[PDB]
Design a protein around this ligand. Structure first.
Ligand SMILES: [Cu+2]
Ligand SMILES: [Cu+2]
Ligand SMILES: [Cu+2]
Ligand SMILES: [Cu+2]
Ligand SMILES: [Cu+2]
Ligand SMILES: [Cu+2]
Ligand SMILES: [Zn+2]
Ligand SMILES: [Zn+2]
Ligand SMILES: [Zn+2]
Ligand SMILES: [Zn+2]
Ligand SMILES: [Zn+2]
Ligand SMILES: [Zn+2]
Lengths: 105, 105, 105, 105, 105, 105
């Protein structure tokens, strides 16, 4: 499957819609730049299963996205461990623009 | 913290002593060439967490060890996924010289 | 697409069926252990585009496969160069168990 | 061959000189910190051949360069795909400090 | 064996305490967020042994740490080359918040 | 520079000619298949500077070379550490077909 997460709610709020998402092995999470750019997706080394920095760096879209429609996908294949993945938006961190992905396995 | 696994039991049996070992992140597994050489440690691409061939190749000590005392260590850091790691000895595969490492996390 | 290559012909010959395969970027090549095991897939450093040893080592399934059904897949994504990839089976090299994959791009 | 690209024109403009460069496999691209620092080289996941994020991250010199003369080289060997590579300078993005490398092959 | 480096001296100075540390293979360096956040650890491609960008990127904790107590560890295993590793804090670079790790071997 | 090492002496001896070679940073070592094949170049994890298994695996030409003229080159760039690199030929190990490369720096 493919779960779409909008960066910036329609209401004009600095949030990820949905904030919490539960994914199964093989599913894809698609982030779409919606409202109030820029945004980026950052995963901290200790916010991913096993505290793997190597894993966090691969998932983290450090670069800022400005134009609406720009997307970033992550297919959680058999390779990725099971557990919760917490991420955030650096420019809107103070606004509490935080997200969470739970991979069940 | 450092678990020692002997390649070839004192009994003269073609086995890994211990055959099964449970490790925690940060711990090291030390293989020591004991009896009836040669021996090597091979991890198949599908016998490691996530079926990562890249991971299996890094852990696999393909080359044969002949002299007693020769060791090979693997510190299971945060970069290594949790799960069971099955390995074997190529020259003594038919004798059932197989091992298993379970990393909890 | 996914091209299946059988390691050991149905006729009981030590060959790869098919021996020559033409793949497009994105397409996958699946090797299935069929007849007269063991078999392995080895790519020499000079038998791959650009003579990249780093590339040859990643594609090479050095370890021997014994049980029928065991598979090994390689998805030739964008990261893989265009050109011919020649591989062979080490235990059946003298029998001329050689293969060839041509990636068009 | 080695193509030199100056980060910041002699005329004092926030540009890459040259902005567009055509490279052949094997040729190198050298960025030299010239005028009005800082500068960095960023490649977006979708601005490289095949939209490979793994490839973009390896080429991207995220860290800021301040002192004149500081260089960053990239030898486009066989491992690198053919196509256009668009990059930019984060601190001078609004000024349109964008570049483009076309690898023929 | 585990050397602790405080990001921000108790004195309220924007420094790494200690600034210079000598480590042996197998030892771990632990950075603890102490005073005047944020802080991050950045290693430049040319400030590590062999000028390996791949190595620098793995060690660099690009993301900003705000809460006191947050830590980042690096166990200098056999895969890491011997030599000096110079790092810095991006937000406090002008204050001269620079560090240095010397791995003996 | 480029130092040529012949795998199998003209005298018909199972040796590397020369057995010992001193190389400077940037020099290339070229192994040429000469007499009494097969041969391969294997570096053990503990026979290279720093006991880096990752380094040993990259230098090791595991696969057997049969036809005369087949070569294998290794350019010891700034990346490679200084020290002695001991290697051997697996099929002719008992004959004492061992070599040694000393990189001065
Ligand atoms: Cu945001
Ligand atoms: Cu054995
Ligand atoms: Cu075969
Ligand atoms: Cu700039
Ligand atoms: Cu700081
Ligand atoms: Cu030999
Ligand atoms: Zn962190
Ligand atoms: Zn396999
Ligand atoms: Zn070769
Ligand atoms: Zn992107
Ligand atoms: Zn740099
Ligand atoms: Zn060894």
């Amino acid at each position: 499957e493919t779960f779409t997460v909008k960066m910036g709610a329609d209401s004009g709020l600095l949030q990820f819609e949905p904030a919490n998402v539960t994914v199964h092995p093989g599913d894809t999470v698609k982030w779409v730049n919606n409202k109030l750019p820029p945004h980026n997706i950052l995963f901290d080394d200790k916010q991913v299963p096993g505290a793997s920095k190597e894993l966090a760096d691969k998932l983290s879209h450090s670069q800022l996205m400005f134009s609406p429609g720009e997307s970033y996908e992550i297919t959680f294949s058999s390779d990725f461990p099971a557990g919760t993945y917490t991420y955030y938006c650096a420019p809107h961190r103070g606004a509490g623009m935080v997200g969470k992905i739970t991979v069940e396995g």
